[PDB]
Design a protein around this ligand. Structure first.
Ligand SMILES: CC(=O)SCCNC(=O)CCNC(=O)[C@H](O)C(C)(C)COP(=O)(O)OP(=O)(O)OC[C@H]1O[C@@H](n2cnc3c(N)ncnc32)[C@H](O)[C@@H]1OP(=O)(O)O
Length: 152
């Protein structure tokens, strides 16, 4: 059901976002970056091989002081498969690989201010802190919450 993401998963991934299309805006870019950090990014696949959820991530390329840290760049579970703990499961596997493989000291992400489900997922169940608002972060103008999880 869960396996590393591949370049050929792009179409399946796009199809997870049929009812929240802004998640496709940067998907290809983030997928290319994901692939260049093996073991960080995962797809969840139904009995027919169909992608029904995914997590994309990357390590910072030129970290300050050489201190490794990670970014979750996109996570999505199609509506049919939501509320099953799939996103939780994907995020945890990505987290564990960041720490165990690349020695991440922490991880960061951005989320739209209006994305109540994702904020709850990050803040309540995965215990991220909120650093603050990054004004006009998205191409369409919306602010992002900048969020962080320390692996200390
Ligand atoms: C860094 C970025 O990628 S930001 C963009 C985030 N991704 C998107 O918004 C894509 C569109 N949305 C999605 O695909 C989904 O709604 C996701 C990925 C946010 C959540 O996927 P799910 O599989 O439903 O979440 P999952 O079942 O693993 O976890 C549930 C938890 O997330 C939270 N949550 C999920 N949906 C909701 C909801 N509709 N409203 C409130 N909290 C919610 C809760 O805190 C919850 O724990 P609980 O079951 O004890 O209440």
């Amino acid at each position: 059901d869960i396996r590393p993401a591949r370049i050929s998963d792009l179409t399946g991934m796009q199809n997870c976002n049929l009812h929240n299309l802004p998640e496709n805006y940067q998907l290809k870019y983030y997928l290319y970056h994901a692939i260049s950090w093996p073991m960080l990014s995962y797809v969840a696949t139904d009995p027919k091989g169909r992608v029904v959820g995914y997590v994309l991530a990357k390590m910072e390329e030129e970290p300050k002081d050489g201190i490794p840290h990670g970014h979750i760049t996109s996570v999505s579970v199609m509506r049919s498969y939501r509320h099953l703990g799939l996103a939780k499961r994907l995020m945890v596997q990505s987290q564990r690989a960041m720490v165990e493989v690349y020695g991440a000291k922490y991880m960061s992400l951005h989320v739209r201010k209006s994305n109540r489900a994702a904020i709850h997922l990050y803040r309540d169940t995965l215990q991220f802190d909120v650093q603050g608002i990054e004004s006009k972060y998205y191409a369409d103008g919306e602010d992002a919450y900048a969020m962080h999880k320390d692996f200390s």
